[PDB]
């Protein structure tokens, strides 16, 4: 890594600057360098890592969907052969997306997850692991698509087991995990009934725990509860 010569604290400071400048590829490289210093990450630092790569892969996923849509139109009845360009370029973006996902998964595996003992850190990293296998699954078609889906499911499931044991039902990490696992069920696993049941049970159990929260925690939890409600409205 080109970041080996820079102080950990400077990498974190520059990641925050890159976020302000909306330079998310820089931000991801800075946070990758910070992870490779080998120390565990604080709550704030975990968020910086997640925000950086989510923006990077988010742009790649959006581009992949545009190109995949063009490619599928070109392969219809009554279509005019445009050459291999659309497929070739979709493949390029797809390969670049898979590289980013592999990089994130490599950071989690070496060695963020194995050193994460607290529920807040371990659930956070395992949710990330499920997310980036889910992004790999979105573009997967070959011999390994089933194995990629199972890798996503296994990470989400371990994270769910820990969060139900160790976190209250309104914990924002627990809520966001259930939200994304429900999206996994609906969009990846062809299990819309599991997706709806998880979102509904998550929402209802959070609703019954809101009375325990401060004004600020209430705002944090109800924000994610609304996202669960938005999905249920779309799915039913």
């Amino acid at each position: 890594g080109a970041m080996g010569s820079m102080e950990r604290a400077s990498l974190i400071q520059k990641a925050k600057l890159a976020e302000q400048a909306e330079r998310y590829e820089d931000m991801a490289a800075f946070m990758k360098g910070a992870v490779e210093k080998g120390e565990e990450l604080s709550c704030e630092e975990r968020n910086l890592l997640s925000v950086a790569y989510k923006n990077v892969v988010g742009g790649q996923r959006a581009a992949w969907r545009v190109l995949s849509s063009i490619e599928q139109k070109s392969n219809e009845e009554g279509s005019e052969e445009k050459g291999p360009e659309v497929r070739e370029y979709r493949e390029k973006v797809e390969t670049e997306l898979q590289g980013v996902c592999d990089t994130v998964l490599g950071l989690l595996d070496s060695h963020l997850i194995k050193e994460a003992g607290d529920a807040e850190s371990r659930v956070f990293y395992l949710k990330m692991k499920g997310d980036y296998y889910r992004y790999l699954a979105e573009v997967a078609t070959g011999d390994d698509k089933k194995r990629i889906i199972d890798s996503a499911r296994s990470a989400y499931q371990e994270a769910m087991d820990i969060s139900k044991k160790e976190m209250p039902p309104t914990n924002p990490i627990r809520l966001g995990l259930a939200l994304n696992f429900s999206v996994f069920h609906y969009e990846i696993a062809n299990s819309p009934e599991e997706a709806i049941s998880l979102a509904k049970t998550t929402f209802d159990e959070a609703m019954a725990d809101l009375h325990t929260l401060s004004e600020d925690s209430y705002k944090d939890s109800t924000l994610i509860m609304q996202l669960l409600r938005d999905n249920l409205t779309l799915w039913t």
């Binding site: 976020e19 704030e44 968020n47 910086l48 997640s50 925000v51 989510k54 923006n55 988010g58 997310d131 966001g176 939200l179 994304n180 999206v183 609906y186 969009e187 994610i224 996202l227 938005d230 999905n231 779309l234 799915w235």
Partner: peptide, 9 residues
């Protein structure tokens, strides 16, 4: 169907 947006810390 929306996952956690999570693009602003």
């Amino acid at each position: 169907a929306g996952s956690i947006p999570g693009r602003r810390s």
